[PDB]
Amino acid sequence: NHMNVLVIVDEFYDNKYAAPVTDIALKCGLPTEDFLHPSNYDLLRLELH
Amino acid sequence: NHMNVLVIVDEFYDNKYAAPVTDIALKCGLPTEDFLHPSNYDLLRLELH
Amino acid sequence: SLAHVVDQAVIETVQDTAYDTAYPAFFYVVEAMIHGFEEKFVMNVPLVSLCINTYWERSGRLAFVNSFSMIKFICRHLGNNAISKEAYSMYRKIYGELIALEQALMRLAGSDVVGDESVGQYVCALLDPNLLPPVAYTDIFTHLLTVSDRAPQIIIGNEVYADTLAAPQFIERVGNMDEMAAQFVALYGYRVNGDHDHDFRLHLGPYVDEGHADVLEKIFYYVFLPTCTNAHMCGLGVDFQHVAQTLAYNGPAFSHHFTRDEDILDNLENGTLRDLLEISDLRPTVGMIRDLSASFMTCPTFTRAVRVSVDNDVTQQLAPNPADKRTEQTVLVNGLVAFAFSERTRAVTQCLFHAIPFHMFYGDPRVAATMHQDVATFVMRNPQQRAVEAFNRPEQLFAEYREWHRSPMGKYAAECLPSLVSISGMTAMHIKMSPMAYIAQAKL
Amino acid sequence: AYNGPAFSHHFTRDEDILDNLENGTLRDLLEISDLRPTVGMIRDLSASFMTCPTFTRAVRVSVDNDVTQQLAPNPADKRTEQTVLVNGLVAFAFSERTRAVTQCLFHAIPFHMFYGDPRVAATMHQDVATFVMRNPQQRAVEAFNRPE
Amino acid sequence: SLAHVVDQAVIETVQDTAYDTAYPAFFYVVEAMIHGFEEKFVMNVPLVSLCINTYWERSGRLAFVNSFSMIKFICRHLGNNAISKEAYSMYRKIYGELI
Amino acid sequence: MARRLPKPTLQGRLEADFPDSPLLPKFQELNQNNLPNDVFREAQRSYLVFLTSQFCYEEYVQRTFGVPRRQRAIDKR
Amino acid sequence: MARRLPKPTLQGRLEADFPDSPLLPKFQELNQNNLPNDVFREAQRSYLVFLTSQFCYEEYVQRTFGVPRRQRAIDKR
Numbered sequence: 010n011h012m013n014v015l016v017i018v019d020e021f022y023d024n025k026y027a028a029p030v031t032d033i034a035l036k037c038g039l040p041t042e043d044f045l046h047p048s049n050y051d052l053l054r055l056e057l058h
Numbered sequence: 059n060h061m062n063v064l065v066i067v068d069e070f071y072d073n074k075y076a077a078p079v080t081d082i083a084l085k086c087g088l089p090t091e092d093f094l095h096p097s098n099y100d101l102l103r104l105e106l107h
Numbered sequence: 108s109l110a111h112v113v114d115q116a117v118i119e120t121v122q123d124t125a126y127d128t129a130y131p132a133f134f135y136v137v138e139a140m141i142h143g144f145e146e147k148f149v150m151n152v153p154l155v156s157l158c159i160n161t162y163w164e165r166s167g168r169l170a171f172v173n174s175f176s177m178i179k180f181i182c183r184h185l186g187n188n189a190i191s192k193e194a195y196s197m198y199r200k201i202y203g204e205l206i207a208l209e210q211a212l213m214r215l216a217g218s219d220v221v222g223d224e225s226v227g228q229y230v231c232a233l234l235d236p237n238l239l240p241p242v243a244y245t246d247i248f249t250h251l252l253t254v255s256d257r258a259p260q261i262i263i264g265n266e267v268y269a270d271t272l273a274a275p276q277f278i279e280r281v282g283n284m285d286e287m288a289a290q291f292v293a294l295y296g297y298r299v300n301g302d303h304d305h306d307f308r309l310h311l312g313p314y315v316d317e318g319h320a321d322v323l324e325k326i327f328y329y330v331f332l333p334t335c336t337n338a339h340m341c342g343l344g345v346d347f348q349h350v351a352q353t354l355a356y357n358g359p360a361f362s363h364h365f366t367r368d369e370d371i372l373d374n375l376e377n378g379t380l381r382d383l384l385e386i387s388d389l390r391p392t393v394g395m396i397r398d399l400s401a402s403f404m405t406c407p408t409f410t411r412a413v414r415v416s417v418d419n420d421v422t423q424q425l426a427p428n429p430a431d432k433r434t435e436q437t438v439l440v441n442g443l444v445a446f447a448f449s450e451r452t453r454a455v456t457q458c459l460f461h462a463i464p465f466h467m468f469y470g471d472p473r474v475a476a477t478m479h480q481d482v483a484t485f486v487m488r489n490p491q492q493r494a495v496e497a498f499n500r501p502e503q504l505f506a507e508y509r510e511w512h513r514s515p516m517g518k519y520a521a522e523c524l525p526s527l528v529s530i531s532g533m534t535a536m537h538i539k540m541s542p543m544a545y546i547a548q549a550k551l
Numbered sequence: 552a553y554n555g556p557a558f559s560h561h562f563t564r565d566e567d568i569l570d571n572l573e574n575g576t577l578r579d580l581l582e583i584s585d586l587r588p589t590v591g592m593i594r595d596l597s598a599s600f601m602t603c604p605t606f607t608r609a610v611r612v613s614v615d616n617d618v619t620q621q622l623a624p625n626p627a628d629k630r631t632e633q634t635v636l637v638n639g640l641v642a643f644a645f646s647e648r649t650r651a652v653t654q655c656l657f658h659a660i661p662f663h664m665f666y667g668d669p670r671v672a673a674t675m676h677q678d679v680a681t682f683v684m685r686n687p688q689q690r691a692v693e694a695f696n697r698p699e
Numbered sequence: 700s701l702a703h704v705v706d707q708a709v710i711e712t713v714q715d716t717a718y719d720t721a722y723p724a725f726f727y728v729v730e731a732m733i734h735g736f737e738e739k740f741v742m743n744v745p746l747v748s749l750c751i752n753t754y755w756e757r758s759g760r761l762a763f764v765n766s767f768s769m770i771k772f773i774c775r776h777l778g779n780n781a782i783s784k785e786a787y788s789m790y791r792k793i794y795g796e797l798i
Numbered sequence: 799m800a801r802r803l804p805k806p807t808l809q810g811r812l813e814a815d816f817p818d819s820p821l822l823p824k825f826q827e828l829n830q831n832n833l834p835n836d837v838f839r840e841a842q843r844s845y846l847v848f849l850t851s852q853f854c855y856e857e858y859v860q861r862t863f864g865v866p867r868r869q870r871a872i873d874k875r
Numbered sequence: 876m877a878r879r880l881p882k883p884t885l886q887g888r889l890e891a892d893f894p895d896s897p898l899l900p901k902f903q904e905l906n907q908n909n910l911p912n913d914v915f916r917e918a919q920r921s922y923l924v925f926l927t928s929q930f931c932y933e934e935y936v937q938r939t940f941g942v943p944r945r946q947r948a949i950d951k952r
Contacts, residue, residue, distance in 0.1 A: 571874065
């Protein structure tokens with residue numbers, strides 16, 4: 010609602026704990042063979058296209 | 059008919075909306091392999107001599 | 108058949124400017140203050156000439172790499188005598204390379220057209236005018252509302268914006284500086300007697316149609332700078348009235364006694380301005396700082412953020428969801444992106460500036476952790492966020508999926524080499540993966 | 552000629568120009584280049600106005616081809632033709648700061664295959680430039696479109 | 700069996716002059732007053748001296764590459780101690796190339 | 799939810815002490831009808847910013863006019 | 876005459892100015908007579924340009940000629 014970006018940055022970064030990580034953050038950090046190894050079934054489940 | 063060149067430039071370039079491109083201006087764009095490919099049969103039809 | 112005008116040594120020069128832990132913050136404030144107008148920069152030509160001269164001779168580096176408009180200004184005029192001749196060449200090679208990549212993309216674009224419009228819009232995201240560059244000082248938004256066929260909805264806070272006719276009721280134009288001579292007091296009284304919180308109004312100067320359309324600014328912000336810095340830059344918010352209270356409440360500014368041409372550091376009273384000048388190691392004359400004080404009338408009140416949301420082209424539009432037919436983006440209004448600050452610099456600089464995370468190239472944990480204590484304690488208490496891909500930015504500002512530049516772009520740019528072949532690779536990744544773009548690829 | 556320092560008989564020949572030049576095209580034109588010529592040099596340039604020719608023109612020379620290449624059904628196909636620019640010069644691309652100064656005195660004529668260039672002719676005319684901005688595929692020199 | 704008289708550096712110089720954004724426009728006025736007459740170049744030589752000299756000093760680039768007549772006149776009429784040798788060698792080698 | 803930034807440290811009450819200028823009588827017009835004294839000094843500071851910037855812009859406009867012909871014809875003789 | 880480039884920015888009043896040129900009485904031969912104001916003013920400015928250019932070429936002609944042997948022979952004593 011409000012225009013002020015100062016409080017936008019502050020209230021998101023005021024008090025934080027263990028922080029979420031997205032899917033493609035981990036889809037871009039693995040090498041080829043470790044990705045294609047069948048121990049990351051999550052990532053191979055969600056890269057169909 | 060009239061001698062002044064500035065009128066000739068401005069009257070041609072003032073309100074033109076479209077750009078026609080000639081034959082050889084399209085022939086010089088293409089590489090050899092696509093030029094011989096039969097997708098382009100309009101341009102290839104007129105390279106007889 | 109592109110040949111790179113630019114050279115490797117100038118890219119190493121830009122890289123050395125990118126990792127400068129002694130970057131002069133006063134020049135950075137001046138950069139924030141002109142904000143990309145021709146007339147405002149002709150207000151301040153001899154100051155920035157002194158700035159570039161002294162920073163180029165004192166160490167082998169140049170400032171003002173950051174903002175594109177200051178680059179185009181320095182390339183366009185002044186030059187010649189005031190700055191050193193070698194320091195002009197870096198800027199010339201940057202601007203020439205930015206020109207040459209455009210004809211490279213145009214040659215990769217086809218000569219043939221679908222209908223009236225050109226097909227380079229479908230081939231390259233850079234050539235595509237639906238995309239917007241991050242820093243906006245000219246009114247790109249109304250122009251994009253005109254030219255874009257597919258519905259370009261603009262979000263300002265709560266309020267949508269989709270009609271050109273709404274341009275008075277949602278946008279306040281900034282008048283030209285000579286014209287606003289009657290309305291200076293009405294511009295100023297809005298600060299005291301108007302609330303800028305939940306304003307929903309955007310104060311913007313006039314757009315300029317001059318040349319090169321939009322391709323150059325896009326290739327400069329999205330190709331050259333993320334490569335040359337390893338993408339270590341963040342968005343900046345500026346509190347302008349505090350900057351005016353620094354410069355204008357100065358002792359020589361009141362002074363009938365103190366002359367036009369003297370060293371301000373001889374006769375300053377102790378303050379944040381003196382400390383900024385000494386850390387920035389540059390003695391300015393009084394008339395320069397009075398010009399920078401005079402520029403406050405026309406410059407805007409505060410920084411803002413804007414969401415741009417444009418429907419896809421007809422090649423890739425197919426989706427079961429209406430919300431997934433449309434691709435979303437951010438534009439920073441009256442703010443500027445940022446190299447890393449020094450730790451000593453953030454003691455007086457914090458009263459002027461604040462951090463903004465932005466899209467993947469311009470959202471960085473180290474620079475934003477430099478600007479705030481909260482971001483610093485966050486990144487310290489959680490070091491895994493130190494990489495660009497993991498770092499969590501607000502939903503109020505940022506979303507990874509609904510964008511043009513995703514995470515692997517930034518991951519490529521972080522470990523990117525300063526070679527110009529990497530410039531070519533960064534350019535080559537911008538192909539839209541469209542069916543007719545595959546024809547364009549099959550040609551070459 | 553109309554400058555004033557070149558006008559006044561009282562002012563000395565050898566002296567620099569910019570100590571007395573008033574706001575106008577000479578101040579901007581020299582301030583772009585930061586060139587200080589002496590006043591009598593500008594006087595000798597002002598002396599050129601006697602045999603200074605009139606406006607630039609375009610003249611088309613149409614000749615028959617070679618006699619080895621003479622064979623054709625059409626006699627008009629035999630001629631090959633070329634347009635020579637009379638009293639005019641060829642030039643590089645202008646700056647945009649210098650455009651507002653040079654616009655008073657100079658105008659573009661794209662007339663030859665090597666000399667018909669979009670980035671150079673785009674600076675000189677706003678019409679050519681806006682035409683380029685509307686469809687950017689004109690930026691090719693081979694596809695660039697000139698008056699008939 | 701030709702041997703070239705111009706090296707790659709002077710071609711780089713001329714290419715740089717081509718791609719100059721800040722080419723001094725006042726030179727064109729000079730060219731407009733010259734317009735390919737011998738006698739008027741002999742009249743206006745102490746101005747083209749200063750023009751060539753100052754643009755050679757401000758950048759490594761050189762001036763007056765536009766018309767053949769100007770380069771012909773600079774190769775012919777100068778021949779003096781005053782104009783810098785390095786600038787003169789460029790025009791000399793270009794005319795030697797055409798020869 | 800309005801916490802923008804604090805003031806950068808500067809000299810207190812400089813314009814009351816140091817100058818005697820044309821800015822002083824226009825400064826005399828300013829009044830404190832409602833606001834607290836610290837907020838009054840803040841708005842006073844912004845108003846002094848506004849006045850000094852007015853004056854510097856006017857001096858620049860005076861500089862922009864340049865040099866006339868007839869004055870040079872008078873004195874340079 | 877159909878389309879001309881716009882007139883270059885120049886300072887005016889070079890005719891009625893303080894410096895006095897010997898060409899000025901011959902310039903008094905031209906009169907408005909038929910013409911409107913602005914046309915005649917710019918036409919007479921162009922005519923003064925032609926006069927000053929003629930004067931410059933005449934002075935250059937007199938300048939170029941050289942120095943006689945007899946004057947340098949008198950320059951002994």
